[PDB]
Ligand SMILES: Cc1cc2[nH]c(=O)nc(N)n2n1
Ligand SMILES: Cc1cc2[nH]c(=O)nc(N)n2n1
């Protein structure tokens with residue numbers, strides 16, 4: 161990592177100096193879900209280019225506001241390794257949120273469906289992940305440990321909060337959806353090219369249910385600094401294993417995350 | 427990436443200024459296939475060290491010429507990640523070729539046979555690939571997208587041209603070879619060490635038919651900029667899964683690629 | 693790599709100038725096995741910070757001495773990729789040892805047990821490895837080859853010396869242990885976070901018996917320069933595949949390595 165603890169502190173202090181908003185929840189909005197910021201009350205926007213130390217698709221804006229009675233901060237757009245970012249830059253905002261007093265991180269993305277029972281328009285609660293770049297040492301925690309954030313060797317087996325996963329299923333039932341809420345394992349790869357058929361079949365055989373190019377590094381850094389995490393993949397395509405509806409599902413995920421603010425503790 | 431669009435343009439213009447040759451096909455010759463340049467008529471050679479912007483085994487020379495009636499440009503020798511090159515350097519010449527007006531890229535390499543039915547001396551048409559460095563984010567397209575070359579998120583599932591694969595099988599039949607033309611999935615790993623038995627068995631179980639240390643990044647960049655691609659692995663060794671003839675096969679691959687120039691469209 | 697052959701030479705000469713000890717064996721002590729240096733006779737210690745060119749957990753000290761009648765040099769503590777080291781720094785001392793005249797490298801680590809028949813306190817002879825960072829090109833040999841050390845493309849399938857593995861089993865029998873000596877495949881990943889359940893199940897299905905964050909790069913560089921290699925994992929935890937005793941085993945591994953000095957050739 162190239163940021164010091166004080167760089168994260170400088171940024172969080174700057175934000176605290178520019179808004180009265182004191183969010184307890186942070187939401188990182190992935191592809192096609194930038195529309196969720198429109199649901200916010202008492203909204204305040206900062207372009208990423210205006211926030212000291214922020215890394216330079218979606219808007220590139222941070223929006224504070226009230227969602228279903230809950231103070232939250234949202235990333236409308238995220239940072240991607242395939243854009244040339246190292247993970248220590250991709251995940252900069254996660255530590256900033258911890259230093260604002262955020263306790264819960266919600267992550268969303270759009271993903272390719274590997275599980276043969278998934279359909280375009282499915283929402284997958286993320287139950288677990290597989291971190292392929294992490295296998296090779298590309299990791300946002302690589303470098304000397306900052307103990308002011310967390311431990312040298314953090315556990316990742318409980319990353320996706322089990323109580324929030326229960327709330328998620330209960331809430332979905334309340335919504336009266338005809339399609340079941342999917343859940344499963346997300347695998348991250350670098351991108352930016354889409355996968356070959358041979359790569360897809362390999363990934364499915366590893367136990368992955370969905371494939372994307374983001375999110376995992378944010379979850380690792382969140383868990384390291386003690387945030388509660390839950391998240392969702394929008395299944396916007398079903399992958400080909402042999403040699404649109406995303407819009408309505410995105411709107412559905414927006415209502416869903418909105419309802420779920422009620423179920424986040426404290 | 428560290429090259430600008432104009433760097434590729436400067437190089438292509440320099441080449442166009444130094445030869446009357448106007449190739450429509452480019453061929454990257456892998457290990458033991460540097461001998462194919464000897465088949466060229468009206469041949470013109472440039473050492474890589476003489477071409478502005480070119481990255482600094484085989485010759486390290488670019489040879490223009492006519493092969494079986496077709497204008498082509500050949501890399502006698504390629505660049506390898508295990509030599510210390512980043513992929514954006516390994517693949518520099520591919521974009522240069524696009525800017526010369528090349529439409530088709532033929533890739534060749536020598537590989538270890540993972541499929542138990544392969545023998546030393548086999549030629550494998552590459553049907554598909556698995557990009558292991560790409561899983562971790564080592565990718566020649568990593569960085570901001572150059573739209574003058576192609577799209578942010580290119581498909582890779584159709585990388586190995588299906589019509590050329592049909593031509594390849596038909597031509598091989600015409601040659602009257604007693605051994606069948608193999609085809610399958612190539613997996614790239616970094617190298618430069620050869621694999622352990624445990625690594626080989628894992629790779630086979632991923633669905634790979636052959637293992638090598640090159641080629642995949644060239645195919646990705648080729649497809650990104652719209653080149654038609656086909657390629658072959660020379661099976662120069664059969665890998666050990668339990669705890670020479672390459673020379674005649676190389677000459678055979680040379681005749682084979684030579685005959686196939688006739689079947690490339692336009 | 694950033695070191696020249698002469699950098700390794702400078703360091704080895706400096707060491708030869710500061711001790712009369714002329715070790716034929718080198719031992720790299722992993723997590724919880726720093727206690728083995730206490731068994732040494734005629735011991736001489738150098739903090740890593742005192743040795744020119746050495747990269748900057750355990751002690752960070754190099755200890756020369758006699759173990760069970762055999763001249764050896766020990767790393768009390770190793771260097772880790774997750775600390776921010778590139779492999780060419782992690783493995784610097786291995787080449788230094790070759791230049792001191794060391795012929796045999798013993799590697800030890802603590803690992804997570806993936807094989808369902810392993811228990812906490814097991815010792816696993818390393819029979820083979822899987823190098824995940826190596827699949828993506830993170831490799832200590834990446835860069836131009838130094839022929840004064842070894843070949844461009846070294847074999848890795850015979851990395852863990854078969855005769856030493858026989859000695860190891862015979863010696864363990866002599867010790868009269870009630871638990872069998874385990875043996876198996878070690879897989880390295882980057883860390884520093886521990887694995888998810890989905891990652892563990894994937895790793896087991898690749899054929900790995902134990903998971904850790906070290907060792908493999910040291911073995912690769914050792915084999916490249918011609919060292920005989922053997923090693924052991926201490927199974928200090930059994931990994932969870934569903935959604936302490938390490939101290940006595942560490943002392944046992946210490947006695948075990950001590951006895952085995954007798955069985956190293958010459
Ligand atoms: C919507 C979406 C996003 C991704 N990312 C990916 O790596 N592979 C896919 N197939 N998809 N699909
Ligand atoms: C001829 C050849 C080339 C390679 N490359 C590789 O990674 N593994 C092999 N076994 N072989 N064999």
Ligand SMILES: Cc1cc2[nH]c(=O)nc(N)n2n1
Nearest residue numbers: 802803804903904905928929
């Ligand atoms: C003692 C130990 C060391 C490691 N390293 C690792 O990557 N995963 C584990 N589970 N463990 N356990």
Ligand SMILES: [Mg+2]
Nearest residue numbers: 180202203204
């Ligand atoms: Mg306001």
Ligand SMILES: [Mg+2]
Nearest residue numbers: 446468469470
């Ligand atoms: Mg001429």
Ligand SMILES: [Mg+2]
Nearest residue numbers: 712734735736
């Ligand atoms: Mg002394």
